[PDB]
Structures are given as structure tokens and as C-alpha cells.
DNA sequence: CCCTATACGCGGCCGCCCTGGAGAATCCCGGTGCCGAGGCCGCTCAATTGGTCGTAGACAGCTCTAGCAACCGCTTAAACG
């Protein structure tokens, strides 16, 4: 992914590792970006390599 | 036996062919005069040297705004086949 594109609306159930390769000067930015895995419904444990 | 015409060799004069010494034209050398260029001298004014002083600009500091790299997203009109 790139981090900036798409807004809200991607969906990613089957996701269950997010790796930020490169951290982001908004760290809210960074937040929707590991919240498309982290959403209501996920079945796993998410974990986040940064 | 003597005179007289007769054909034949040729002393002298004139013209033609071959070779030698004197003079004239030419090239080289030495002395000398003139043009281009280089060196020297005289004036002479502007560059040089020394000192003084004002200030132009480098430096530092603080504040605000434009630019820049790399990404996004939507529209739509322009570019392209």
C-alpha cells in the first residue's frame, strides 16, 4: 500500500500483519494505515512491525 | 729545202678556301652611400609610495514567506492514434 491513498473505504478482512516501512510525520495517517486491518470483525491477532 | 698554217703545253693573273691574333662584352670583387631599424637622451606628467581617515560591506541575529520533493485525489479538456 501506499499510505496516503483511498481514504476509509479499503477493506482488508483477510489482513493480519501490517508492516510500516516508513513512518509517517502524521501519526494519524499511520493510524488509518494499520486500522485497515484492525477493524470490527477481524478473526486474528493483528500485529504491527514498524 | 724553206715558208706557213696548226694544234698543244703552260708563265702570269685573278678568284676562292682554311686559320690566326687583336679587341669587345660579361661576371665577380672591393669600396662606398642610402633606407629601415635599433639604441640613447631629454622633457615631463601621471603612476607609485606613504600616511590618514571615513565607511561599505561582511557578519551575526531574529522574523515571515516562497519554494521543493514526493505523494494524494478529482475533473476535464487537450493530446494522440
Given at each position: 500500500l501506499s499510505t496516503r491513498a483511498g481514504g476509509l473505504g479499503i477493506n482488508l478482512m483477510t489482513a493480519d500483519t501490517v508492516v510500516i516501512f516508513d513512518s509517517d510525520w502524521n501519526p494519524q495517517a499511520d493510524?488509518?494505515?494499520?486500522a485497515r486491518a484492525?477493524?470490527?470483525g477481524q478473526k486474528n491477532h493483528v500485529m504491527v512491525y514498524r
Open positions: 493510524l488509518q494505515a494499520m484492525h477493524r470490527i
